[PDB]
Amino acid sequence: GENKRKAKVKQIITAESRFVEVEGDKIEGLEEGETPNVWGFIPIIHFKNEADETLKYGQSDIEPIEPLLKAYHDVMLHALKGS
Amino acid sequence: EKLRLLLNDKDKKSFTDEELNLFLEEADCIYCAASQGWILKSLQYENTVGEMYEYKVGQETYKSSSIKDLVSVAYQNADKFKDMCTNKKEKGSFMLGISTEFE
């Protein structure tokens, strides 16, 4: 209709079950509390770009290049200002 | 007191005080006003020491400094006071920065 709805939802996803709770307005499709997992493994796949044995998470390809982007941007802006 | 200091800078007791206050109004810096006073005092030499610089009468001779020398000295004093005022106000050279907006 017209009403505004706010909700700060967080939910734990575990292999045997997932525990979901919401703080705020009701979300109809989500059943609060814990619900059993139909299988004994977590159905969420973590895709990890440039994964390393010393890293918990993956790495974006921009990350090695971004200081060069900073340098290029600074030089270009200085050139444009001077021109 | 500005009046006394001007009567000392510009030499004393040939003007009267109201035009000295006027000269102070002409410029806040006392030395500029004293310089202007020095020109307008150099003008007055035509009366105080006329064009007749030297004369011998009887057994006395007196050789006054000619009007050109006195007026030249007065203009020299005026130039010194002007230079001193410019020294007081003038600041040196210095570098700055340029700013320009861009996207």
Coordinates of N, CA and C in Angstrom, one line a residue:
Chain A
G1 N 0.8 -1.2 0.0 CA 0.0 0.0 0.0 C 0.9 1.2 0.0
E2 N 1.0 1.8 1.2 CA 1.8 3.1 1.3 C 2.8 3.0 2.5
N3 N 2.7 2.1 3.4 CA 3.5 2.2 4.7 C 5.0 1.9 4.4
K4 N 5.8 2.5 5.2 CA 7.3 2.3 5.2 C 7.6 1.2 6.2
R5 N 8.5 0.3 5.9 CA 8.9 -0.8 6.8 C 10.4 -0.9 6.9
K6 N 10.9 -0.9 8.2 CA 12.3 -1.0 8.5 C 12.5 -2.3 9.3
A7 N 13.6 -3.0 9.0 CA 13.9 -4.2 9.7 C 15.4 -4.5 9.7
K8 N 16.0 -4.7 10.8 CA 17.5 -5.1 10.9 C 17.5 -6.6 11.1
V9 N 17.6 -7.3 10.0 CA 17.6 -8.8 10.0 C 19.0 -9.3 10.0
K10 N 19.3 -10.3 10.9 CA 20.5 -11.1 10.8 C 20.1 -12.5 11.1
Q11 N 20.9 -13.5 10.6 CA 20.6 -14.9 10.6 C 21.8 -15.7 10.5
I12 N 22.0 -16.7 11.4 CA 23.1 -17.6 11.4 C 22.7 -18.8 10.6
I13 N 23.6 -19.2 9.6 CA 23.4 -20.3 8.7 C 24.5 -21.3 9.1
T14 N 24.0 -22.4 9.7 CA 24.9 -23.5 10.1 C 24.5 -24.8 9.4
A15 N 25.4 -25.8 9.5 CA 25.2 -27.0 8.7 C 23.9 -27.8 9.1
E16 N 23.6 -28.0 10.4 CA 22.5 -28.7 10.8 C 21.2 -27.8 10.9
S17 N 21.3 -26.5 11.0 CA 20.2 -25.6 11.1 C 20.6 -24.2 10.9
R18 N 19.7 -23.3 10.8 CA 19.9 -21.9 10.7 C 19.0 -21.1 11.6
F19 N 19.6 -20.2 12.4 CA 18.9 -19.4 13.4 C 18.8 -18.0 12.9
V20 N 17.5 -17.6 12.7 CA 17.2 -16.3 12.1 C 16.4 -15.5 13.1
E21 N 16.7 -14.2 13.3 CA 16.0 -13.3 14.2 C 15.9 -11.9 13.5
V22 N 14.9 -11.2 13.8 CA 14.7 -9.8 13.2 C 14.4 -8.8 14.3
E23 N 14.9 -7.6 14.1 CA 14.7 -6.5 15.1 C 13.9 -5.5 14.3
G24 N 12.6 -5.3 14.5 CA 11.8 -4.3 13.9 C 10.5 -4.9 13.3
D25 N 10.1 -4.4 12.2 CA 8.9 -4.7 11.6 C 8.9 -6.2 11.1
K26 N 7.6 -6.8 11.0 CA 7.5 -8.2 10.7 C 7.9 -8.4 9.2
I27 N 8.6 -9.5 9.0 CA 8.8 -10.0 7.6 C 8.1 -11.3 7.5
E28 N 7.1 -11.3 6.5 CA 6.1 -12.4 6.5 C 6.8 -13.7 6.1
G29 N 7.6 -13.7 5.1 CA 8.1 -15.0 4.5 C 9.1 -15.7 5.4
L30 N 9.8 -14.9 6.3 CA 10.8 -15.5 7.2 C 10.2 -15.8 8.5
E31 N 10.4 -17.1 8.9 CA 10.0 -17.6 10.2 C 11.1 -17.4 11.3
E32 N 10.8 -16.6 12.3 CA 11.8 -16.3 13.3 C 12.1 -17.5 14.2
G33 N 13.2 -17.4 14.8 CA 13.7 -18.5 15.6 C 14.6 -19.4 14.7
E34 N 14.8 -20.6 15.2 CA 15.6 -21.6 14.5 C 14.7 -22.5 13.7
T35 N 15.3 -23.0 12.5 CA 14.6 -24.0 11.7 C 15.6 -25.0 11.3
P36 N 15.2 -26.3 11.2 CA 16.2 -27.3 10.8 C 16.6 -27.2 9.4
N37 N 17.9 -27.6 9.2 CA 18.5 -27.7 7.8 C 18.1 -29.0 7.2
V38 N 17.6 -29.0 6.0 CA 17.2 -30.3 5.4 C 18.4 -31.2 5.1
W39 N 19.6 -30.7 5.1 CA 20.9 -31.4 4.9 C 21.9 -31.0 5.9
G40 N 22.8 -31.9 6.2 CA 23.8 -31.6 7.3 C 25.1 -30.9 6.8
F41 N 24.9 -29.9 5.8 CA 26.0 -29.1 5.4 C 25.4 -27.7 5.0
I42 N 26.3 -26.7 5.0 CA 25.9 -25.4 4.8 C 25.7 -25.2 3.3
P43 N 24.5 -24.7 2.8 CA 24.3 -24.6 1.4 C 24.9 -23.3 0.8
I44 N 25.7 -22.6 1.5 CA 26.4 -21.3 1.0 C 27.8 -21.6 0.6
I45 N 28.1 -21.2 -0.7 CA 29.4 -21.4 -1.2 C 30.2 -20.1 -1.2
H46 N 31.4 -20.1 -0.7 CA 32.2 -18.9 -0.7 C 33.2 -19.1 -1.9
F47 N 33.0 -18.1 -2.8 CA 34.0 -18.0 -3.9 C 35.0 -17.0 -3.5
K48 N 36.3 -17.4 -3.7 CA 37.4 -16.6 -3.1 C 38.4 -16.3 -4.2
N49 N 38.3 -15.1 -4.7 CA 39.2 -14.6 -5.7 C 40.6 -14.5 -5.1
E50 N 41.6 -15.0 -5.8 CA 43.0 -14.8 -5.5 C 43.3 -15.3 -4.0
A51 N 42.6 -16.4 -3.7 CA 42.8 -16.9 -2.3 C 44.2 -17.3 -2.0
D52 N 44.6 -17.1 -0.8 CA 46.0 -17.4 -0.3 C 45.9 -18.1 1.0
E53 N 46.9 -19.0 1.2 CA 46.9 -19.8 2.4 C 47.1 -18.9 3.7
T54 N 47.5 -17.7 3.6 CA 47.7 -16.8 4.7 C 46.5 -15.8 4.8
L55 N 45.4 -16.0 4.0 CA 44.3 -15.1 4.0 C 43.0 -15.8 4.3
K56 N 42.2 -15.2 5.2 CA 40.9 -15.8 5.4 C 39.9 -15.6 4.3
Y57 N 39.9 -14.4 3.7 CA 39.0 -14.0 2.6 C 39.7 -13.9 1.3
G58 N 38.9 -13.6 0.2 CA 39.5 -13.4 -1.1 C 39.9 -12.0 -1.4
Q59 N 40.5 -11.8 -2.5 CA 41.1 -10.5 -2.9 C 40.6 -10.1 -4.3
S60 N 40.2 -8.8 -4.3 CA 39.8 -8.2 -5.6 C 41.0 -7.9 -6.4
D61 N 40.9 -8.0 -7.7 CA 42.0 -7.8 -8.6 C 42.4 -6.3 -8.7
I62 N 41.5 -5.4 -8.3 CA 41.8 -4.0 -8.3 C 42.9 -3.7 -7.2
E63 N 43.0 -4.5 -6.2 CA 43.8 -4.1 -5.0 C 45.3 -3.9 -5.3
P64 N 46.0 -4.7 -6.1 CA 47.3 -4.4 -6.4 C 47.4 -3.1 -7.3
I65 N 46.4 -2.8 -8.1 CA 46.5 -1.7 -9.0 C 46.1 -0.4 -8.5
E66 N 45.3 -0.4 -7.4 CA 44.6 0.9 -7.0 C 45.6 2.0 -6.5
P67 N 46.8 1.7 -5.9 CA 47.7 2.8 -5.7 C 48.2 3.5 -7.0
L68 N 48.3 2.7 -8.1 CA 48.7 3.3 -9.4 C 47.5 4.1 -9.9
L69 N 46.3 3.7 -9.6 CA 45.1 4.5 -10.0 C 45.2 5.8 -9.2
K70 N 45.5 5.8 -8.0 CA 45.7 7.0 -7.2 C 46.7 7.9 -7.8
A71 N 47.9 7.4 -8.2 CA 48.9 8.2 -8.8 C 48.5 8.8 -10.1
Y72 N 47.9 7.9 -11.0 CA 47.4 8.4 -12.3 C 46.4 9.5 -12.1
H73 N 45.4 9.3 -11.2 CA 44.4 10.3 -11.0 C 45.0 11.6 -10.5
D74 N 46.0 11.6 -9.6 CA 46.6 12.8 -9.0 C 47.3 13.5 -10.1
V75 N 48.1 12.8 -10.9 CA 48.9 13.4 -12.0 C 47.9 14.0 -13.0
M76 N 46.9 13.3 -13.4 CA 46.0 13.8 -14.4 C 45.2 15.1 -13.9
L77 N 44.8 15.1 -12.6 CA 44.1 16.2 -12.1 C 45.0 17.4 -12.0
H78 N 46.3 17.2 -11.6 CA 47.3 18.3 -11.5 C 47.5 18.8 -12.9
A79 N 47.6 18.0 -13.9 CA 47.8 18.4 -15.3 C 46.6 19.3 -15.8
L80 N 45.4 18.8 -15.5 CA 44.2 19.5 -16.0 C 44.1 20.9 -15.3
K81 N 44.4 20.9 -14.0 CA 44.4 22.2 -13.2 C 45.4 23.1 -13.8
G82 N 46.6 22.7 -14.0 CA 47.7 23.5 -14.6 C 47.3 24.0 -16.0
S83 N 46.8 23.2 -16.8 CA 46.4 23.6 -18.1 C 45.3 24.6 -18.1
Chain B
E1 N 52.2 63.2 21.2 CA 51.2 64.1 20.5 C 51.7 64.3 19.1
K2 N 50.8 64.1 18.1 CA 51.1 64.2 16.7 C 51.5 65.6 16.4
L3 N 50.9 66.6 17.0 CA 51.2 68.0 16.6 C 52.6 68.3 17.0
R4 N 53.0 68.0 18.2 CA 54.4 68.3 18.7 C 55.4 67.5 17.8
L5 N 55.1 66.3 17.6 CA 56.1 65.5 16.8 C 56.2 66.0 15.4
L6 N 55.1 66.5 14.8 CA 55.2 67.1 13.5 C 56.0 68.5 13.5
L7 N 55.8 69.3 14.6 CA 56.5 70.5 14.7 C 58.0 70.3 15.0
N8 N 58.3 69.1 15.4 CA 59.7 68.7 15.5 C 60.3 68.1 14.2
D9 N 59.5 67.2 13.6 CA 59.9 66.7 12.3 C 59.9 67.8 11.3
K10 N 58.8 68.4 10.9 CA 58.7 69.6 10.2 C 59.1 70.8 11.1
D11 N 60.1 71.6 10.8 CA 60.7 72.5 11.8 C 59.6 73.5 12.2
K12 N 59.9 74.0 13.4 CA 58.8 74.6 14.3 C 58.6 76.1 14.0
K13 N 57.3 76.5 14.3 CA 57.0 77.9 14.5 C 57.0 78.7 13.2
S14 N 56.7 78.1 12.1 CA 56.4 78.8 10.8 C 55.0 78.6 10.3
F15 N 54.3 77.6 10.8 CA 52.9 77.4 10.5 C 52.1 77.6 11.8
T16 N 50.8 77.4 11.7 CA 49.9 77.3 12.9 C 49.1 76.0 12.8
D17 N 48.6 75.6 14.0 CA 48.3 74.2 14.3 C 47.2 73.6 13.5
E18 N 46.2 74.4 13.1 CA 45.1 73.9 12.4 C 45.4 73.3 11.0
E19 N 46.3 73.9 10.3 CA 46.7 73.3 9.0 C 47.6 72.1 9.3
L20 N 48.3 72.0 10.4 CA 49.1 70.8 10.8 C 48.1 69.7 11.0
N21 N 47.0 69.9 11.7 CA 46.0 68.9 11.9 C 45.4 68.5 10.5
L22 N 45.2 69.5 9.6 CA 44.8 69.2 8.3 C 45.8 68.3 7.5
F23 N 47.1 68.5 7.7 CA 48.1 67.7 7.0 C 48.1 66.3 7.6
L24 N 47.9 66.2 8.9 CA 47.7 64.8 9.5 C 46.5 64.1 8.9
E25 N 45.4 64.9 8.6 CA 44.3 64.3 7.9 C 44.6 63.9 6.5
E26 N 45.5 64.6 5.8 CA 45.9 64.2 4.5 C 46.5 62.8 4.4
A27 N 47.2 62.4 5.4 CA 47.7 61.0 5.4 C 48.0 60.6 6.9
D28 N 47.5 59.4 7.2 CA 47.7 58.9 8.6 C 49.2 58.8 9.0
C29 N 50.0 58.4 8.1 CA 51.5 58.3 8.4 C 52.0 59.7 8.6
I30 N 52.6 59.9 9.8 CA 53.1 61.2 10.1 C 54.2 61.7 9.2
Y31 N 55.0 60.8 8.7 CA 56.1 61.2 7.8 C 55.7 61.7 6.5
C32 N 54.6 61.2 5.9 CA 54.1 61.7 4.7 C 53.5 63.1 4.9
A33 N 52.8 63.4 6.0 CA 52.3 64.7 6.3 C 53.5 65.7 6.6
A34 N 54.6 65.2 7.2 CA 55.7 66.0 7.4 C 56.4 66.4 6.1
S35 N 56.4 65.4 5.2 CA 57.0 65.7 3.8 C 56.2 66.8 3.1
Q36 N 54.8 66.6 3.1 CA 54.0 67.7 2.5 C 54.2 69.0 3.2
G37 N 54.3 69.0 4.5 CA 54.7 70.2 5.2 C 56.0 70.8 4.8
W38 N 57.0 69.9 4.4 CA 58.3 70.4 4.0 C 58.2 71.1 2.7
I39 N 57.5 70.5 1.7 CA 57.3 71.3 0.5 C 56.6 72.6 0.7
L40 N 55.5 72.6 1.5 CA 54.8 73.9 1.7 C 55.6 74.8 2.6
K41 N 56.6 74.4 3.3 CA 57.5 75.2 4.0 C 58.6 75.7 3.0
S42 N 59.1 74.9 2.1 CA 60.0 75.3 1.1 C 59.5 76.5 0.3
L43 N 58.2 76.4 0.0 CA 57.5 77.6 -0.7 C 57.8 78.9 0.1
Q44 N 57.8 78.9 1.4 CA 57.8 80.1 2.2 C 59.2 80.8 2.2
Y45 N 60.2 80.1 1.7 CA 61.5 80.8 1.7 C 61.6 82.0 0.8
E46 N 60.6 82.2 -0.1 CA 60.6 83.4 -0.9 C 60.4 84.7 -0.1
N47 N 59.8 84.5 1.1 CA 59.6 85.6 2.0 C 60.6 85.7 3.1
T48 N 60.9 84.6 3.8 CA 61.8 84.6 4.9 C 63.2 85.0 4.5
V49 N 63.7 84.5 3.4 CA 65.0 84.9 2.8 C 64.7 85.1 1.4
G50 N 64.6 86.4 1.0 CA 64.2 86.8 -0.3 C 65.3 86.4 -1.4
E51 N 65.0 86.8 -2.6 CA 66.0 86.5 -3.7 C 67.3 87.2 -3.4
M52 N 67.4 88.3 -2.7 CA 68.6 89.0 -2.4 C 69.4 88.2 -1.3
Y53 N 70.4 87.4 -1.8 CA 71.1 86.5 -0.9 C 72.3 87.2 -0.3
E54 N 73.0 88.1 -1.0 CA 74.2 88.7 -0.5 C 74.0 90.3 -0.6
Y55 N 74.5 91.0 0.4 CA 74.6 92.4 0.3 C 75.7 92.9 1.2
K56 N 76.4 94.0 0.7 CA 77.4 94.7 1.5 C 76.9 96.1 1.7
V57 N 76.8 96.6 3.0 CA 76.4 97.9 3.3 C 77.3 98.5 4.4
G58 N 77.9 99.6 4.1 CA 78.8 100.2 5.1 C 80.0 99.4 5.2
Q59 N 80.3 98.8 6.4 CA 81.4 97.9 6.7 C 80.9 96.5 7.0
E60 N 79.7 96.2 6.7 CA 79.1 94.8 6.9 C 78.8 94.2 5.6
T61 N 79.1 92.9 5.4 CA 78.7 92.1 4.3 C 78.1 90.8 4.9
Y62 N 77.0 90.4 4.4 CA 76.3 89.1 4.8 C 76.0 88.4 3.6
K63 N 76.4 87.1 3.5 CA 76.2 86.2 2.4 C 75.3 85.1 2.8
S64 N 74.0 85.3 2.6 CA 73.0 84.2 2.9 C 73.0 83.1 1.8
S65 N 72.6 81.9 2.2 CA 72.4 80.9 1.3 C 71.3 81.3 0.3
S66 N 71.5 81.1 -1.0 CA 70.6 81.5 -2.0 C 69.3 80.7 -1.8
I67 N 68.2 81.2 -2.4 CA 66.9 80.6 -2.3 C 67.0 79.2 -2.9
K68 N 67.8 79.0 -4.0 CA 67.9 77.7 -4.6 C 68.4 76.7 -3.7
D69 N 69.5 77.0 -2.9 CA 70.1 76.1 -2.0 C 69.1 75.7 -0.9
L70 N 68.4 76.7 -0.3 CA 67.5 76.4 0.7 C 66.3 75.5 0.3
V71 N 65.7 75.9 -0.9 CA 64.6 75.1 -1.4 C 65.1 73.7 -1.8
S72 N 66.3 73.6 -2.3 CA 66.8 72.3 -2.6 C 67.0 71.4 -1.4
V73 N 67.4 72.0 -0.3 CA 67.6 71.3 0.9 C 66.2 70.9 1.5
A74 N 65.2 71.8 1.3 CA 63.9 71.4 1.8 C 63.3 70.3 1.0
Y75 N 63.5 70.3 -0.3 CA 63.0 69.2 -1.1 C 63.8 67.9 -0.8
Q76 N 65.1 68.0 -0.4 CA 65.8 66.8 0.0 C 65.2 66.3 1.3
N77 N 64.9 67.1 2.2 CA 64.2 66.7 3.5 C 62.9 66.0 3.1
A78 N 62.1 66.6 2.2 CA 60.9 66.0 1.8 C 61.1 64.6 1.2
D79 N 62.1 64.5 0.4 CA 62.3 63.2 -0.2 C 62.8 62.1 0.8
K80 N 63.5 62.6 1.8 CA 63.9 61.6 2.9 C 62.7 61.2 3.7
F81 N 61.8 62.1 4.0 CA 60.6 61.8 4.7 C 59.7 60.9 3.9
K82 N 59.6 61.1 2.6 CA 58.8 60.3 1.7 C 59.4 58.9 1.7
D83 N 60.7 58.8 1.5 CA 61.4 57.5 1.5 C 61.2 56.8 2.8
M84 N 61.2 57.5 3.9 CA 61.1 56.9 5.3 C 59.7 56.3 5.4
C85 N 58.7 57.1 4.9 CA 57.3 56.5 5.0 C 57.2 55.3 4.1
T86 N 57.7 55.3 2.9 CA 57.6 54.1 2.1 C 58.4 52.9 2.7
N87 N 59.5 53.2 3.4 CA 60.2 52.2 4.1 C 59.3 51.6 5.2
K88 N 58.5 52.5 5.9 CA 57.6 52.1 7.0 C 56.6 51.1 6.4
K89 N 55.9 51.5 5.3 CA 54.8 50.7 4.8 C 55.2 49.5 4.0
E90 N 56.3 49.6 3.2 CA 56.6 48.6 2.2 C 56.9 47.3 2.8
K91 N 56.4 46.2 2.2 CA 56.7 44.8 2.5 C 57.4 44.2 1.3
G92 N 58.2 43.1 1.6 CA 59.0 42.5 0.6 C 58.2 41.6 -0.3
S93 N 59.0 41.0 -1.2 CA 58.4 40.0 -2.2 C 58.2 38.7 -1.6
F94 N 57.3 37.9 -2.2 CA 56.9 36.6 -1.7 C 56.1 35.8 -2.7
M95 N 56.2 34.5 -2.5 CA 55.5 33.6 -3.4 C 54.2 33.1 -2.8
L96 N 53.2 32.8 -3.6 CA 51.9 32.3 -3.2 C 51.5 31.1 -4.0
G97 N 50.2 30.7 -3.8 CA 49.7 29.5 -4.5 C 48.5 29.9 -5.3
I98 N 48.2 29.1 -6.3 CA 47.0 29.3 -7.2 C 46.1 28.2 -7.0
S99 N 44.8 28.5 -6.9 CA 43.7 27.5 -6.8 C 42.8 27.6 -8.0
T100 N 42.3 26.5 -8.4 CA 41.3 26.4 -9.5 C 40.5 25.2 -9.4
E101 N 39.1 25.4 -9.5 CA 38.2 24.3 -9.3 C 38.2 23.4 -10.6
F102 N 37.9 22.1 -10.4 CA 37.9 21.2 -11.5 C 37.0 20.0 -11.1
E103 N 36.5 19.3 -12.1 CA 35.5 18.2 -11.8 C 36.1 17.1 -10.9

